[PDB]
Structure formats: C-alpha cells, structure tokens
Design a protein around this ligand. Structure first.
Ligand SMILES: [Zn+2]
Ligand SMILES: [Zn+2]
Lengths: 53, 53
C-alpha cells in the first residue's frame, strides 16, 4: 500500500547528506571513501526510477 | 565534523523500512531488485562501522 515514495525519499536524503558531507570531507582520504557509497546510491536511484510508475 | 552518526541513522532508517518492504515484495521479480539494494545498502553500514569512533 503506497510505500515506494517512502523508500526513494529516504534513499535520496542520504545522497543529499552525502553531497553536504562531501563539502566538509574535502580531504582526499574521506573524499575517495564516501564517493563509492555515492556511486552505489546513484545505482539504487537509477533502479528506483526504472521501477517507478 | 562528527556528522557520521547522522548519515548512518538515515542510512539505517531506509534499512528498517527495507526490512518490511522485503515482506510486501514477496513476488520474486521484486525480491531480486530490492535485494541488490539490500546487499549494497548493508555494505555502507559495514564501512560506516570501520569509519566510526
Ligand atoms: Zn541506497
Ligand atoms: Zn547507503
């Protein structure tokens, strides 16, 4: 029952946290560790769009 | 600076939702599409534990 926007929005609230965290985490150690989670979340967001209708 | 807990919690609020989404997604087509998120999305928590302090 009407449950998929609830998943996707929390899914993108992490991606948007990951943008702002990247501004603070500008050091190359963390900037190359949160980037792999960012690319994994962009993968989920692609599939979430493919599954939306 | 100490934002890592805030990211992990929103990362786990999707995961706690996803724990129940898997029951409504009992159909095996869906249960092999949200499953690849679940395996990636547990992986973030796995690295976040190594990042914690
Ligand atoms: Zn995700
Ligand atoms: Zn994640």
């Amino acid at each position: 029952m009407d449950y998929l926007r609830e998943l996707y929005k929390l899914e993108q609230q992490a991606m948007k946290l990951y943008r702002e965290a990247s501004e603070k985490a500008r050091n190359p150690e963390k900037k190359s560790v949160l980037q792999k989670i960012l690319e994994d979340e962009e993968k989920h967001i692609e599939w979430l769009e493919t599954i939306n209708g």
